[PDB]
Design a protein around this ligand. Sequence first.
Ligand SMILES: CCO/N=C/c1ccc(OCC[C@@H](C)CCN2CCN(c3ccnc(N)c3)C2=O)cc1
Ligand code: NA
Lengths: 297, 50, 245, 58, 58, 58
Amino acid sequence: GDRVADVIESSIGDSVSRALTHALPAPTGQNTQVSSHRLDTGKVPALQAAEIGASSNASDESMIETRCVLNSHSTAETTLDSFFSRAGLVGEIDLPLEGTTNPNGYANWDIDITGYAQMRRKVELFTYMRFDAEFTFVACTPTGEVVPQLLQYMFVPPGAPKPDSRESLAWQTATNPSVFVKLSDPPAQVSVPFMSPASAYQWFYDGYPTFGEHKQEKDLEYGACPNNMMGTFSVRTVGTSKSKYPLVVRIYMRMKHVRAWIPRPMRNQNYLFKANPNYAGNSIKPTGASRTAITTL
Amino acid sequence: GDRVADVIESSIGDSVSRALTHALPAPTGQNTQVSSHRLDTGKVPALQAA
Amino acid sequence: SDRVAQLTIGNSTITTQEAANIIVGYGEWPSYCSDSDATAVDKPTRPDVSVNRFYTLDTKLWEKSSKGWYWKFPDVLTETGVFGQNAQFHYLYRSGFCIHVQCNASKFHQGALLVAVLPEYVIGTVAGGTGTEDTHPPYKQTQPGADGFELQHPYVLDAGIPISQLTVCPHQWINLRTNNCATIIVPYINALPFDSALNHCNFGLLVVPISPLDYDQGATPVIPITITLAPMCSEFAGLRQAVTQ
Amino acid sequence: SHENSNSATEGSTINYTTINYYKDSYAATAGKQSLKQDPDKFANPVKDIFTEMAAPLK
Amino acid sequence: SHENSNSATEGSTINYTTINYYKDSYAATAGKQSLKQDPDKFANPVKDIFTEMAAPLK
Amino acid sequence: SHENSNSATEGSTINYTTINYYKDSYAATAGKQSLKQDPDKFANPVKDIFTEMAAPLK
Ligand SMILES: CCO/N=C/c1ccc(OCC[C@@H](C)CCN2CCN(c3ccnc(N)c3)C2=O)cc1
Ligand code: NA
């Protein structure tokens, strides 16, 4: 029971986050209303105080004399799904015959889509994103030729044994999901759910994954969030003897059922590494084009 | 006939010149009313902005 | 009547006679974690007044050549007062913040600071200049504590992103001819209901001059910028011994 | 279809119109999203809202 | 089908009978068009219409 | 579908929601199973059940 007044009247424990704004339906661009000449004192729409942190509330109607315009231009193509649900390249896996990389007929790719700038720059517009995804695998030789070869793709979640060879016992794939397909077949394609332990994936994590002294040698772990590490994608040619052909597997991703939070400035310096935002300090370039004078086009 | 909104709602053609003032009968000089001491804040008749 | 303001929380009161309203980040107020968003089962502790109060942590000097600074939250407070102690004794922490950046001058000085809050402010390095070296920022740069840290390349916010777009984040400007402070209220921002006040910095506070400070010889040249901040709705769970990192 | 509710948007403030042939809803199409918008959350997150006609600082 | 209205003929004076399996209507078949005609627009755009029996210039 | 009842789970204490295109039900999909559980069968198969608060041996 409670009796002292400050306890009865406190707000400690209020889980209802009060919201100063609410969404409205806006299937089309706003219309324009007729406006006429205004010659007033006291009324001043053109004057703002940008210091406040809000954007101007001035509209066409109050700055010039406007006609009526019934605007039926749609706002549909700028939704998150419209913008992101377009498959882009996010991974490439080589399975050469003669080589330095994966000459043993198998390969393990850590699921990380930050190795390609087009896709990466789009997702990094937001801090947190939650989505399902459709993955498509396009395979052929390095000339784009289609050969009669059978492949096996297997998803190895964190903790499952990563194959260490084309004949690894792990390919028995009794619980991991595997896909068997020919290069002659169309590109394999599957749906992937939102698998993070968190409520959303996050493209930026300003922190460390563990406790302790964060000395020089461990600084590569700054920004590492296991909540974003979904596992390994393993591929092999299905056989006990080496394949007769050199292969390449391109990985495409199409997000769907997207939600995103906290917009942020968009990358304006070339990307260097997957794991961080490092930029080349001797080549800091302006965000865009320049000119000779401010008084000349 | 008219149909576009800006035409229907325009004031083009208003021949009634709006007047901010009107005349009053004033056959004699104005009278003077009794007044007393006023010691107020906010009220300032003596100050103008020519 | 929007230029004047009083902020009272805990045993602390702030006044200002040249304010520019108040910004409530992403349009929502701080709140305690609900029973359905929560996952941890221990009953939390909500110290209230002893930790949700204003702490004045640091003062920087604004000079005609200053490049700008940043601080990390909740890092700036992990070693201060009762808030710091709870942050150290507990694994889980969550709270919001009321940030009040102060900077006053005279009607003859000029300059404008951009005060902004950027969630998950990951810092990058110049990569050995040539960009061929995968160097990483040291702990003192990612979590600078109360003293903050000075930006090396403000134009790209030391992270390869344009400061020109920083206004997409909750902000206010301190433009000397107009106001002498910025006030921003920030709710808890994360993909989890609670997290470590030690290993994770939810957002960074950036104070960057965009229009350089200027004044004529003879005017007071020492123009401080002071940082005061208050935790709001602080909650802690997962009790054990105190740990500093 | 009596399927599982395993989509990334189950319990969203925007309803979708999708197609699916599997028992797991995340396998469904992207469909159409709801056209609601809230610019103010970013363009005008002020505590005390100020009118257009008025002087923002009075 | 509750799809988008993105066909080149959305809001036409001739209704079509089409088939489609996608959320975008322009993906639909050509179908059948309405058999309305208006030759006069080209063959007889005169202000003051003249009868057949009469002498066109009187 | 009026098929044969030849599934391994015909007459189970858990009902399934499956798809099938053949006259034999075992050809059907795995579908969804019922989410009933009975831990006690293994974790607490005691004759005379003892409360939490009490002392298990009195
Ligand atoms: C036969 C079986 O076929 N299986 C296919 C298959 C396909 C995909 C798959 O998992 C896809 C995971 C992606 C949807 C999200 C990847 N994400 C999340 C955020 N993240 C980040 C965040 C921060 N920094 C970095 N560097 C990266 C990142 O890279 C699992 C299995
Ligand atoms: Na953490």
